[PDB]
Design a binder for this molecule. Structure first.
Ligand SMILES: Nc1nc2c(ncn2[C@@H]2O[C@H](COP(=O)(O)OP(=O)(O)OP(=O)(O)O)[C@@H](O)[C@H]2O)c(=O)[nH]1
Ligand SMILES: Nc1nc2c(ncn2[C@@H]2O[C@H](COP(=O)(O)OP(=O)(O)O)[C@@H](O)[C@H]2O)c(=O)[nH]1
Ligand SMILES: [Mg+2]
Lengths: 376, 96, 55, 437, 431
């Protein structure tokens, strides 16, 4: 009808020519899942009622990228007081920093977060340093747990997560359980801190205890002032792109757990909100020789993707070993032939397989550089 | 009257295709003999910007055969009494 | 208390909050701070640039 | 070394200078503080800013302009504006009383106490300049500071600097709309006293820019911001040959001794074109032939006078961007074969093109689109004789009844100066009608 | 640095001056004590045009309150915004003017004029540029009519090079409120026409009409009238105090509005003047402003411009606006009402833009007309003057007070000269 819920946000789209970032009003209508767009400055009607099938309610996430009709919008502001007070709840940023004790057991942690229903939006694997403890000088020299925890941050890598669920600060705390991992294992039987971790500060997470302290932690992390660096080291490695469909339907934890369990090693982790142009440059080798170029680009752009760098200690070559571990092209062909591999236990069709791999065993270095040194 | 890109078969597209083909020929021969500007900058960055260790003194005295970095301390008048010209920051002696 | 010389209106007209509308030459000159949206950022990151040439 | 001194006099000139120096700072990469953008180098390799900025010992670029207004109203706003530390404090001079639409108050009494100060500042800037190409005097014919003080300044610059070519940007009164009621008096007196002192008079109007912004830039409510931004684009395209490299460079001296046929005939018409908005340059390509045709249409002219009713003495065609010397020749050939535009019989070769490599700079807030090409057409034509005749008719309509004369008489001007100026412009009309035949 | 000294004469002059010093006090953010309770620097940039700096953050107006009774001087001191004036620019008499021009001009008001000139000379040498003097008085009264024009004459003799403007309240055709009002109008405007650069002639029943039918108010008192007069006075001089796209001070207005030195009688007007309850339902724009300016309804003087012809128009637009609309609609009103304009002055409208609106209104406009149709006012006052002067009516109160009838004959001859001078350009053909 005329009014059926009017979730409106300010969005910005950079016009590739003339250098402008034009400002538009996004007007998502629930109960029919439609989108409307107004043109700020020179009042007009940019998009009608429509029925766009790229934007869904779970996508939104002010601060993200949405591709409606190949215009890569960035949602930037909570316009309207109604939408501000209606999505201050439900959508909450929370930090999910995995401690270096669980540096090898992150796959099951991702599996439980996606089973609980936390839409991760940004993720990295970071080294930190002495001066990079702005996350933890808030609790400044209260006890020697300050020095012990700073040393624990400096020893070993971490995986920074930016999760979200309904009233997310508090369900993240419920998923973690209380602190003091021994006591947490004593009372909570299925929390992350109960399943993994040994004692105090060996707790596998830290949480996002209070609101706007979560915002401070994320702004020290992921954002326009983020000076964090990934743990990419190049050498004999290969790509482990995990597609947005497999990320969305609760399979990323299983995929990364299988990757870690069969062998290999995840050396660099990153989570991308890809664009149309960048997806086309990544899949430009998949031009009119396979004839799913458009669908592959669309499924990359239609959600967040997981970039992983894979090495191995089995020698041979990592590219061919990983290409043998991954199903070849199609889920049906991977199910009938070599069903113990990937892309068969996780597979729908040739477009949304589960994952992507370096087909040529001579360009994995260049693709890893494109992910972890170029587009970063 | 209008002009399209050479990918569209309207005007002088054959000669434009031959021209860009010869530019590709020149790029391949220059890459074969290794005198590209991008290679010339990339290997410069890869070789010169490589970290090196420094010899540690056990008594604070400089010894023969030590590595040593010769550096200049920053100016002690970082106030910008003359706006626009930057005061002398920390300098390190290096080779051009 | 009948004071026939009182104004009966403190100000003529009432559609304001007291602020001043930031005069036209000032609005002209403050547009120099609007170069962030006129910046020529390139969201067309090419697959090869100068660190991958050796590879 | 290719120096150029800008003198912005009048309340019109100060605002045109505001837009002009915003455009110059953007084009040469200069912050409102006057530094390089976030520094990162000083270098000294760059020299394109030397024509408009003075490279001091501090690495702080200051403009080579002089802001003059008799009233301290807009110069004070420039002082407490964003370009506060960019301008030198003594560089922005002003008085206490204003000339008040009175050419007598501009040229006499009130004007004859700041003329020494402005000549002193221009002398200091000329001693700064090594290789001064000339002067760019931005004023308005409308009256007061822009007429009387401009006439005094041009007279005492001509008798002090030799030739030293002077380029006057004039805000003409529009045929239908205008502001003052003594404006025909002021315009006629200032053009009579500047005819023998101006090397070239870049003529622009107000109703023409209003119609251009309504018709092509598509703003139903344009203003002096847009007007001054367009004039800034015109003068930037004119001086781009001095500043940046190009295939053909057309300097100032180039422009005078290629454009004007006779010393009295020095009133051309400007037309800068790409003329299009940001949401309409998106869909249409802007080729050299079509932008030259857009210049030669009788609707993009910056003065409200039809060039279809007069002949073209000369044309200067300044291109910016990626204009190729083949399609410029194609466009000029098409213009020459088009019979609607008539050229005079004694000038068979009547074009002077110059191609500059630098593309136009889009201002953060202006309505001009980011365009890779530009053409500025400066045509010496006979179509402004109609404007002169209309101005003299408006003059005679009041001067028959001797209205608004006692102000000038009491402020110092003799009563015969009005008649002498009328004689001079009647001579100018006769000169134009005997040249264009 | 241009400065204007304000001089208040009489009952009505003191009251409208107090309202003026209220409206340009809360335009500049000045509290009743005298400090600066403002927010922007534009208020304090050019406060020296109407204010003198004092000890601390105080600001004393450069206004001289003159009246020949303790009276309204005391009431202005007691009322609000009455502690802002210096208690030395408060010269008052002890006797009464008696609504008598002779009493104001020659008897006891004359011996206080020396102290008034002492005060004005002190405040004038306290200036730096001194653009000029403005005076508010009450033509038809006794203090502002005679002693006010004595002030006009002596100050014009003292400084015959600075802009001297007077606003003045002319008598109304309907009602009287003074029997000797035609006398105190005639031989006071006779003095006013000789030595004033521009006069504004704000009538009173027109103020009643504007208050009653543009603002309603049922009973409008005197504060609404003083408010309209004060708004007009502020809108005339706004360009001296605030920056704008196209400034126009008092000398710009005089040059662009006075063709001949004896034709400086003006038609003041203000826009918008819509009522308090009806202002929320109209889009306040340039077309509405221009039409509510140029209708004959909104004239703040009692003269109807339809019976005459406009010589010159001045439009001062206060507020941020795009003035292409302003220029094109000045064109439009000139072309639509070209019958009501002289044909021998092409472009007989003067446009000014000052992009700071008054507090309250988001955009406003002040109208100053030099229409020929002012001769009806002088003709009516001459008719009422010769009604009494042929029969020696109330002349003894002037002659025994000490004067002659030849001055009255000179005054009526000068008013008939003004009437003939306006009537010639009423229908002076061009060609
Ligand atoms: N194009 C353009 N013209 C302007 C601008 N400002 C004023 N003008 C012109 O200037 C005329 C008004 O006279 P001014 O030039 O302001 O007079 P002045 O130079 O200040 O000298 P005085 O009259 O003594 O104050 C108007 O008719 C306008 O056409 C502007 O910003 N852009
Ligand atoms: N606009 C206005 N007019 C007034 C006011 N008070 C008195 N008048 C007019 O002034 C006239 C009387 O002149 P007056 O000022 O008393 O002369 P004075 O006695 O010499 O001061 C009357 O016709 C009134 O209409 C006022 O507050 N506002
Ligand atoms: Mg001016």
């Amino acid at each position: 009808s005329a009014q059926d819920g009017r979730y409106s946000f300010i969005c910005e789209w950079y016009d590739p020519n003339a250098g402008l970032t034009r400002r538009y009003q996004f007007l998502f209508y629930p109960k029919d899942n439609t989108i409307e767009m107004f043109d700020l400055k020179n009042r007009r009607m940019f998009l009608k009622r429509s029925a766009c099938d790229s934007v869904h309610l779970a996508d939104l996430y002010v601060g993200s990228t949405v591709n409606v009709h190949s215009r890569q919008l960035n949602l930037v502001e909570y316009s309207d007081d109604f939408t501000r007070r209606a999505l201050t709840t439900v959508k909450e940023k929370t930090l999910g920093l995995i401690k270096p004790d669980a540096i090898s057991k992150f796959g099951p942690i991702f599996d439980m977060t996606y089973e609980a229903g936390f839409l991760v939006t940004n993720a990295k694997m970071t080294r930190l340093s002495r001066n990079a403890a702005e996350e933890f000088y808030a609790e400044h020299v209260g006890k020697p747990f300050y020095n012990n925890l700073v040393s624990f941050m400096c020893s070993g890598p971490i995986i920074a997560l930016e999760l979200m669920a309904n009233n997310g600060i508090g369900e993240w705390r419920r998923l973690l359980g209380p602190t003091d991992s021994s006591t947490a294992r004593s009372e909570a039987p299925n929390s992350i801190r109960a399943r993994f971790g040994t004692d105090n500060t060996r707790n596998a997470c830290h949480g996002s205890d209070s609101v706007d302290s979560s915002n401070r932690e994320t702004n020290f992390f992921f954002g326009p002032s983020a000076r964090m660096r990934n743990t990419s080291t190049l050498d004999n490695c290969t790509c482990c792109i995990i597609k947005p469909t497999a990320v969305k339907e609760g399979k990323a934890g299983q995929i990364m757990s299988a990757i870690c369990n069969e062998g290999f090693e995840v050396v660099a982790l990153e989570m991308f909100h890809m664009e149309k142009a960048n997806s086309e440059e990544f899949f430009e080798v998949y031009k009119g020789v396979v004839a799913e170029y458009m669908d592959m680009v669309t499924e990359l752009t239609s959600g967040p993707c997981y970039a992983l760098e894979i090495r191995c200690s089995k020698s041979d070559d990592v590219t061919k070993a990983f290409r043998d571990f991954v199903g070849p092209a199609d889920p049906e062909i991977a199910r009938q032939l070599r069903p113990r591999t990937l892309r068969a236990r996780f597979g729908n069709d040739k477009v949304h397989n589960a994952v992507h791999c370096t087909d040529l065993p001579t360009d994995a270095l260049l693709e890893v550089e494109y992910f972890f040194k170029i587009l970063s | 009257v209008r002009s399209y890109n050479p990918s569209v078969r309207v005007g002088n597209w054959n000669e434009d295709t031959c021209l860009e083909e010869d530019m590709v020929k020149d790029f391949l021969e220059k890459k074969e003999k290794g005198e590209l500007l991008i290679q010339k900058a990339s290997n410069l960055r890869s070789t010169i910007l490589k970290p090196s260790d420094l010899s540690v003194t056990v008594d604070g005295f400089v010894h023969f055969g030590d590595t040593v970095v010769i550096m200049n301390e920053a100016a002690a008048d970082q106030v910008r009494t003359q706006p626009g010209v930057e005061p002398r920051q920390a300098n390190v002696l290096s080779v051009n | 208390d009948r004071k026939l010389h009182n104004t009966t209106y403190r100000r003529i007209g009432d559609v304001t909050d007291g602020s001043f509308p930031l005069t036209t030459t000032q609005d002209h000159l403050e547009q120099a701070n609007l170069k962030k949206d006129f910046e020529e950022k390139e969201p067309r990151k090419t697959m090869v640039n100068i660190d991958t040439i050796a590879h | 070394m290719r120096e150029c001194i800008s003198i912005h006099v009048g309340q019109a000139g100060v605002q045109i200078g505001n837009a002009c120096w915003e455009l110059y700072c953007l084009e040469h990469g200069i912050q409102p503080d006057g530094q390089m953008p976030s520094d990162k180098t000083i270098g000294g390799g760059d020299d394109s800013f030397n024509t408009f900025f003075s490279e001091t010992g501090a690495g702080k670029h200051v403009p080579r302009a002089v802001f003059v207004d008799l009233e301290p109203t807009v110069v004070d706003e420039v002082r407490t504006g964003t370009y506060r530390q960019l301008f030198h404090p003594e560089q922005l001079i002003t008085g206490k009383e204003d000339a008040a639409n009175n050419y007598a108050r501009g040229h006499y009494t009130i004007g004859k106490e700041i003329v020494d100060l402005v000549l002193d500042r221009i002398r200091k800037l000329a001693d700064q300049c090594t290789g001064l190409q000339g002067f760019l005097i931005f004023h308005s014919f409308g009256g007061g500071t822009g007429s009387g003080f401009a006439s005094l300044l041009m007279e005492r610059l001509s008798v002090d600097y030799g030739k030293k070519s002077k380029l006057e940007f004039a805000i003409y009164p529009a045929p239908q709309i205008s502001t003052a009621v003594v404006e025909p008096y002021n315009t006629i007196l200032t053009t009579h006293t500047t005819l023998e002192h101006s090397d070239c008079a870049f003529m622009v109007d107000n109703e023409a820019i209003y119609d251009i912004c309504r018709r092509n830039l598509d703003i139903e409510r344009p203003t002096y911001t847009n007007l001054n931004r367009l004039i800034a684009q015109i003068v930037s395209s004119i001086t781009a040959s001095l500043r940046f490299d190009g295939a053909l460079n057309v300097d100032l001296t180039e422009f005078q001794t290629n454009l004007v046929p006779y010393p009295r005939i020095h009133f051309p018409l400007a037309t800068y074109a790409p003329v299009i908005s940001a949401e309409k340059a998106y869909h249409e390509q802007l080729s050299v032939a079509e932008i030259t045709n857009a210049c030669f249409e009788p609707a993009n002219q910056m003065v409200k006078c039809d060039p279809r009713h007069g002949k073209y003495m000369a044309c200067c065609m300044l291109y910016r961007g990626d204009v190729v010397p083949k399609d410029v020749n194609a466009a000029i050939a098409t213009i020459k074969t088009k019979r609607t535009i008539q050229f005079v019989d004694w000038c068979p070769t009547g074009f002077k093109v110059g191609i500059n490599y630098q593309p136009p700079t889009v201002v953060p807030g202006g309505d001009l689109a980011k365009v890779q090409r530009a053409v500025c057409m400066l045509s010496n034509t006979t179509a402004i004789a109609e404007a002169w005749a209309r101005l003299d008719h408006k003059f005679d309509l009041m001067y028959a009844k001797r209205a608004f004369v006692h102000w000038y008489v009491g402020e110092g001007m003799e009563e015969g100066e009005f008649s002498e100026a009328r004689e001079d412009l009647a001579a100018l009309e006769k000169d134009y009608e005997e040249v264009g035949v | 640095m241009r400065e204007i000294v304000h001089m208040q004469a009489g009952q009505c002059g003191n009251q409208i001056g107090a309202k003026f010093w209220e409206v340009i006090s809360d335009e500049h953010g000045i509290d009743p004590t005298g400090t600066y309770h403002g927010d922007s620097d534009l208020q304090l940039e050019r406060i020296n045009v109407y204010y003198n700096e004092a000890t601390g953050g105080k600001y004393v107006p450069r206004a001289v309150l003159v009246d020949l009774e303790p009276g309204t001087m005391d009431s202005v001191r007691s009322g609000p915004f009455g502690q802002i004036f210096r208690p030395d620019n408060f010269v008052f008499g002890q006797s009464g003017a008696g609504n008598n021009w002779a009493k104001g001009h020659y008897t006891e008001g004359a011996e206080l004029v020396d102290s008034v000139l002492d005060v004005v000379r002190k405040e004038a040498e306290s200036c730096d540029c001194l653009q000029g003097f403005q005076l508010t008085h009450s033509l038809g009264g006794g203090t502002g009519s005679g002693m006010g024009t004595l002030l006009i004459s002596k100050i014009r003799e003292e400084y015959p090079d600075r802009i001297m403007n007077t606003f003045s309240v002319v008598p109304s055709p309907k009602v009287s409120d003074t029997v000797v009002e035609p006398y105190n109008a005639t031989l006071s405007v006779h003095q006013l026409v000789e030595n004033t650069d521009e006069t504004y002639c704000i009538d009173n029943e027109a103020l009643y009409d504007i208050c009653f039918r543009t603002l309603k108010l049922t009973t409008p008192t005197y504060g609404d009238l003083n408010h309209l007069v004060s708004a007009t006075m502020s809108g005339v001089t706004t360009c001296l105090r605030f920056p704008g796209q196209l400034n126009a001070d008092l000398r710009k207005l005089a040059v662009n509005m006075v063709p001949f030195p004896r034709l400086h009688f003006f038609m003041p007007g203000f826009a918008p003047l819509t009522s308090r309850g009806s202002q929320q339902y109209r889009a306040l724009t340039v077309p509405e402003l221009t039409q509510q300016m140029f209708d004959a309804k909104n004239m703040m003087a009692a003269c109807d411009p339809r019976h005459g012809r406009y010589l010159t128009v001045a439009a001062i637009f206060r507020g941020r606006m795009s003035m292409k609309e302003v220029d094109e609609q000045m064109l439009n009103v000139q072309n639509k009402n070209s019958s009501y304009f002289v044909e021998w002055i092409p472009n007989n409208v003067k446009t000014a833009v000052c992009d700071i609106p008054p507090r309250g209104l988001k955009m406003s406009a002040t109208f100053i007309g030099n229409s020929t149709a002012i001769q009806e006012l002088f003709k009516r006052i001459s008719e009422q003057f010769t009604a009494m002067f042929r029969r020696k009516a109330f002349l003894h109160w002037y002659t025994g007070e000490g004067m002659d009838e030849m001055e009255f004959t000179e005054a009526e001859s000068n008013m008939n000269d003004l009437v003939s001078e306006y009537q010639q350009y009423q229908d002076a053909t061009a060609e």
